[PDB]
Design a protein around this nucleic acid. Structure first.
Ligand SMILES: [Mg+2]
Ligand SMILES: [Mg+2]
Ligand SMILES: [Mg+2]
Ligand SMILES: [Mg+2]
Ligand SMILES: [Mg+2]
Ligand SMILES: [Mg+2]
Ligand SMILES: [Mg+2]
Ligand SMILES: [Mg+2]
Ligand SMILES: [Mg+2]
Ligand SMILES: [Mg+2]
Ligand SMILES: [Mg+2]
Ligand SMILES: [Mg+2]
Ligand SMILES: [Mg+2]
Ligand SMILES: [Mg+2]
Ligand SMILES: [Mg+2]
Ligand SMILES: [Mg+2]
Ligand SMILES: [Mg+2]
Ligand SMILES: [Mg+2]
Ligand SMILES: [Mg+2]
Ligand SMILES: [Mg+2]
Ligand SMILES: [Mg+2]
Ligand SMILES: [Mg+2]
Ligand SMILES: [Mg+2]
Ligand SMILES: [Mg+2]
Ligand SMILES: [Mg+2]
Ligand SMILES: [Mg+2]
Ligand SMILES: [Mg+2]
Ligand SMILES: [Mg+2]
Ligand SMILES: [Mg+2]
Ligand SMILES: [Mg+2]
Ligand SMILES: [Mg+2]
Ligand SMILES: [Mg+2]
Ligand SMILES: [Mg+2]
Ligand SMILES: [Mg+2]
Ligand SMILES: [Mg+2]
Ligand SMILES: [Mg+2]
Ligand SMILES: [Mg+2]
Ligand SMILES: [Mg+2]
Ligand SMILES: [Mg+2]
Ligand SMILES: [Mg+2]
Ligand SMILES: [Mg+2]
Ligand SMILES: [Mg+2]
Ligand SMILES: [Mg+2]
Ligand SMILES: [Mg+2]
Ligand SMILES: [Mg+2]
Ligand SMILES: [Mg+2]
Ligand SMILES: [Mg+2]
Ligand SMILES: [Mg+2]
Ligand SMILES: [Mg+2]
Ligand SMILES: [Mg+2]
Ligand SMILES: [Mg+2]
Ligand SMILES: [Mg+2]
Ligand SMILES: [Mg+2]
Ligand SMILES: [Mg+2]
Ligand SMILES: [Mg+2]
Ligand SMILES: [Mg+2]
Ligand SMILES: [Mg+2]
Ligand SMILES: [Mg+2]
Ligand SMILES: [Mg+2]
Ligand SMILES: [Mg+2]
Ligand SMILES: [Mg+2]
Ligand SMILES: [Mg+2]
Ligand SMILES: [Mg+2]
Ligand SMILES: [Mg+2]
Ligand SMILES: [Mg+2]
Ligand SMILES: [Mg+2]
Ligand SMILES: [Mg+2]
Ligand SMILES: [Zn+2]
Lengths: 69, 60, 95, 106
RNA sequence: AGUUGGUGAGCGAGCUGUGAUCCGGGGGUGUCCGAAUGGGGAAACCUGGAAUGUCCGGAGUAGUGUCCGGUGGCCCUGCCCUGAAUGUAUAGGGGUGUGGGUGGUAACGCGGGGAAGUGAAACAUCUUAGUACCCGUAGGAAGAGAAAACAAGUGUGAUUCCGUGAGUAGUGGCGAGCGAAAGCGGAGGAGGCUAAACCGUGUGUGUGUCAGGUGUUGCAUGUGCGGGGUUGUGGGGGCCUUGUGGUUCUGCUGCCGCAGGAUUGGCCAGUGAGAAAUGUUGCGUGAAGGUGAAGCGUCUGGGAAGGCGUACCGGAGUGGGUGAGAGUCCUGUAACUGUAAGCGUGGCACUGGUGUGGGGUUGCCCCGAGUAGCGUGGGACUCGUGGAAUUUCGCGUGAAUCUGGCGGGACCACCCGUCAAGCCUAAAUACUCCUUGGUGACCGAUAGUGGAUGAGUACCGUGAGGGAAGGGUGAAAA
RNA sequence: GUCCGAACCCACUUCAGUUGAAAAUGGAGGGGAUGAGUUGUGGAUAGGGGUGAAAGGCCAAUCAAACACCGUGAUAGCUGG
RNA sequence: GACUGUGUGGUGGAGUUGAUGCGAGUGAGAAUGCAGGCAUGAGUAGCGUGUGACGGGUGGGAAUCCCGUCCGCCGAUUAUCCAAGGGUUCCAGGGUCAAGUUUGUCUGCCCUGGGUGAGUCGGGUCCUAAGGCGAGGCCGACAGGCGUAGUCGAUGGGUAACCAGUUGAUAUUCUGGUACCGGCUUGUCACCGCAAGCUGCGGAGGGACGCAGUGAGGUAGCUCAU
């Protein structure tokens, strides 16, 4: 569970690196789910919620909802 | 035509009333004439009524 | 612009079955892909993700099965499957 | 929607049912359907099958207190107190909260 | 303090109290179709940018296939350039996105088109009925609305709506039927602008005007913009007897006077229809919440809310749950209370924004024109063509203008009322797709919605369209 | 727009079927079978209208005016309850 | 009299009795009434052209499933492959409530899982016919009608691949071999140059077309063979 408060302290480039890392983790989780692995099925949804959190932070910086560092 | 491009005069609707008063639906159309007009230097045709022709509301 | 696009958005899951396992003997991998992705997009995405030279990408559309249950007719989703033929020795580790 | 006046871990006395007069710790609460599981009260079956407690209505139990050597059942009230609530970012601010007190013990 | 919607549980989580789920408010994302809008199309699909460094920006490749984002639908409109045949010009053409539009919507509104079955014991006038339906077009309501009115001799005084008048007066193959108005009782309760006369202001152009002054000194017409004006026992303009709120002092007319001018009154007047529209302070609330009184013992029962006994609360005994019938077990209820927030909303104060007339005179000047009337063919009015007023559409014809026009049921005269051919106006009235709370000598699964469940579903039909049936274990799945 | 004759198109006779195998067919024969032929695919004409080598024929299995919905709970001096 | 007991059981498991008023969706035997359930005909008619027999297996159960051997049947089609239309019915396993006009261990049925691979095949990305729509526009009280420039629209024109092999289920698609077409890029040769080329825009040629008929030269196929 990422926190939007922490992500709001990160800068844009590290936030996008976080987006890409989360996408890669979701890819790996889906492959494990397909192949019979993945005991931890909650992380499969939590990584997508984390992607949503990072997108919310990035877009609120883009739309000036919160000041962009 | 039956609609004047000036003043927007349109047909009226009423009755044929014969000797026996057996009413039938009929129309009264305005006396629309198609005339050449030159307005603001533009030459064109206009369907205008004779009432706007008599009033001088159209520039020929 | 928001919403970074990733190659991993296009390759959803591998297909694991007897036909797929028999295809793996000839360096051929079956994936479920986004239904709107073409062969060239899939080829480039597979090369980006797996670091492998791809000799071919074939595609098919598999209609979803229809079953009558209580609450009536239920319909499983339609999927697109990409069959990726890989260079002589490159290999893909799907786990 | 809000919660019930009986929470998990409370010591209650059953005031209705087969086990009227029994006293037990509330093991789990079901706020939606207004039913609670009380320790050692409604012993039935589940599902080589586990025999365990069953849920009774939350209105069939009453919180219990020891006044003069006996367990007596009481109702509850709420009093508002000043507290410091913390936002997700960590910031603190003054606010109010309700603390439950037992009647019959002031 | 539990939580990851339901039909319909356990995994793996998160809240592990760093307060989640949840509730209100505001945001972000929002595939494809659909007015659907880059182009095409069998809706939810396809396909794109001539040649060029590529439509523009970015990503990726050696490069091309590729990916992400943007832009460009059409119509009206504004602004700029050019102006055909051809001369003025215009049509058209080329740039810019300046603004608006497109489509949907259950009822109610306004304008227009408009049946038939039916009744008349047949049927054609008539009725049904201006109904059904259709077309155009709104708004939160719409329409109407400030007397070219009623009345009848005194009077009322915009409109709308309700009740009476009254199924009367009438009207009607005087058949079937249709059917007022004045007056009176109420709901509601505003009145406001403008055209024109006259005054300041360019182009189809000047040979006449004591500081001044020139073949014009500001002289001639008819646009636009400002003042003024807005009424009917006529009003206004003009001509004068006068009066503006205290002015720093600039022009023109006669070194009278009139007007732009200014922080500072102000009787006034304001976000309104009112010839108009811009901030900070002042209350209580709906959307969430908060507090919210007071019962135990015995008996029978599976179970107590029931019996018996004895206590409490009540500004709370309306309900509904709980294992049977509860004021005191739960949910609540009465009462108070909070409301951060709203686009919040209403209203007040200030800021800021805009701004007077009274008496006299008729010389003169203005007072809405293809309009009103008239004829003709139709329509609405109680009135079905008549003695036909009033009102309206098509076609002709066609005024007066205050010593004038219109109305008072043909018409004329007098009298009374009124001032058309310009505009805007709240409330009282209509309705309910919706949201919130409540109610019922309403239904209770063949009922009540077609629909208590996968219900506009299954099913039937090419299609428009038609269109069901199926509820109940138990207190607890035990 | 020859002749005989399959496919193909049709439908003259007869038998069966008639609660059928079939809301129009089957068996046996029969007519046309290079033509005014037949057939696939798409398209056009719509209800007082279409189309018709013409039978009031056909227009989605009952057409002297289709079907659907609406006026509408049409009306019935008639039958039934 | 419509009816009824405050008699007495049984079943049942949450309401309801009497007096007096108040209001009715207040009483059914019939409408070729409407809905449901169930009889009568009746264990009756039918079981939809036909040729099956036996041996073994499976199984609780076999005329009706599987395997085999005889025999019979279609063969211008009872074969093989497509279009339209259907939509997972295909394959494998498990099943025998329902469906199958009987039985069924079986199935086009049920449940679970799997299965369809294209530069060249059929469509689009190309082109137009009939026809549709249609910027402006013209016509029309409104609604709408027609139509230019265009844009769609195959049933037609154009367009590059064949043989063999492989699965339980796919195969001009996958695999092997051997080709072809269009791009991008690259080594190399040759040539241009008011005056290279590329793209647009058109002209022309071409595409490009009826019906019937005979003969010739071939080839596929088929037959026979020492
Ligand atoms: Mg004349
Ligand atoms: Mg393919
Ligand atoms: Mg919070
Ligand atoms: Mg609380
Ligand atoms: Mg589009
Ligand atoms: Mg379109
Ligand atoms: Mg280009
Ligand atoms: Mg009529
Ligand atoms: Mg009639
Ligand atoms: Mg009659
Ligand atoms: Mg009659
Ligand atoms: Mg509105
Ligand atoms: Mg109005
Ligand atoms: Mg009155
Ligand atoms: Mg003016
Ligand atoms: Mg309480
Ligand atoms: Mg008791
Ligand atoms: Mg009349
Ligand atoms: Mg008249
Ligand atoms: Mg008159
Ligand atoms: Mg009179
Ligand atoms: Mg006037
Ligand atoms: Mg008005
Ligand atoms: Mg209301
Ligand atoms: Mg029923
Ligand atoms: Mg029902
Ligand atoms: Mg019942
Ligand atoms: Mg259908
Ligand atoms: Mg012949
Ligand atoms: Mg012959
Ligand atoms: Mg025939
Ligand atoms: Mg058609
Ligand atoms: Mg005849
Ligand atoms: Mg027919
Ligand atoms: Mg008939
Ligand atoms: Mg008729
Ligand atoms: Mg009627
Ligand atoms: Mg009674
Ligand atoms: Mg009845
Ligand atoms: Mg009966
Ligand atoms: Mg009966
Ligand atoms: Mg029987
Ligand atoms: Mg027998
Ligand atoms: Mg018999
Ligand atoms: Mg017999
Ligand atoms: Mg028999
Ligand atoms: Mg056999
Ligand atoms: Mg044979
Ligand atoms: Mg298919
Ligand atoms: Mg299946
Ligand atoms: Mg099936
Ligand atoms: Mg099968
Ligand atoms: Mg099987
Ligand atoms: Mg059977
Ligand atoms: Mg089987
Ligand atoms: Mg064409
Ligand atoms: Mg047009
Ligand atoms: Mg095309
Ligand atoms: Mg074709
Ligand atoms: Mg096969
Ligand atoms: Mg092959
Ligand atoms: Mg190959
Ligand atoms: Mg050519
Ligand atoms: Mg040519
Ligand atoms: Mg030719
Ligand atoms: Mg030969
Ligand atoms: Mg041989
Ligand atoms: Zn006119």
């Amino acid at each position: 569970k990422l926190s939007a408060a922490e992500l709001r302290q990160l800068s844009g480039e590290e936030l996008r690196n976080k987006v890409r890392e989360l996408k890669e983790e979701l890819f790996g989780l889906r492959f494990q789910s397909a192949t019979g692995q993945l005991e931890n099925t909650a992380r499969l949804r939590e990584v997508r919620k984390d992607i949503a959190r990072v997108y919310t932070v990035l877009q609120e910086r883009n739309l000036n909802i919160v000041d962009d560092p | 035509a039956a609609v004047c491009d000036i003043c927007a005069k349109r047909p009226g609707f009423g009755h044929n009333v014969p000797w026996s008063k057996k009413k039938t639906n009929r129309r009264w159309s305005p006396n629309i004439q198609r005339v050449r007009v030159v307005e603001n230097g533009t030459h064109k045709r206009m369907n205008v009524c004779t009432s706007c022709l008599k009033a001088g509301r159209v520039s020929r | 612009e928001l919403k970074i696009r990733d190659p991993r958005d296009i390759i959803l899951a591998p297909v694991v079955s007897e036909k797929s396992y028999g295809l793996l003997d000839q360096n051929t991998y079956t994936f479920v892909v986004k239904p709107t992705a073409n062969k060239t997009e899939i080829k480039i995405a597979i090369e980006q993700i797996f670091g492998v030279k791809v000799t071919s990408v074939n595609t098919m559309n598999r209609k979803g099965k229809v079953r009558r249950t209580r609450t009536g007719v239920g319909k499983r989703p339609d999927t697109k499957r990409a069959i990726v033929t890989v260079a002589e020795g490159d290999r893909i580790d799907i786990f | 929607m809000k919660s019930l006046k009986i929470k998990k871990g409370d010591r209650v006395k059953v005031i209705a049912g087969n086990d009227k007069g029994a006293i037990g710790e509330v093991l789990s609460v079901d706020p939606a359907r207004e039913r609670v599981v009380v320790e050692g009260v409604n012993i039935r079956k589940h599902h080589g099958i586990i025999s365990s407690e069953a849920p009774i209505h939350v209105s069939n139990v009453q919180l219990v207190t020891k006044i003069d050597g006996k367990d007596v059942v009481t109702r509850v009230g709420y009093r508002r107190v000043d507290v410091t609530k913390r936002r997700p970012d960590g910031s603190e601010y003054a606010a109010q909260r309700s603390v439950r007190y037992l009647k019959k013990e002031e």
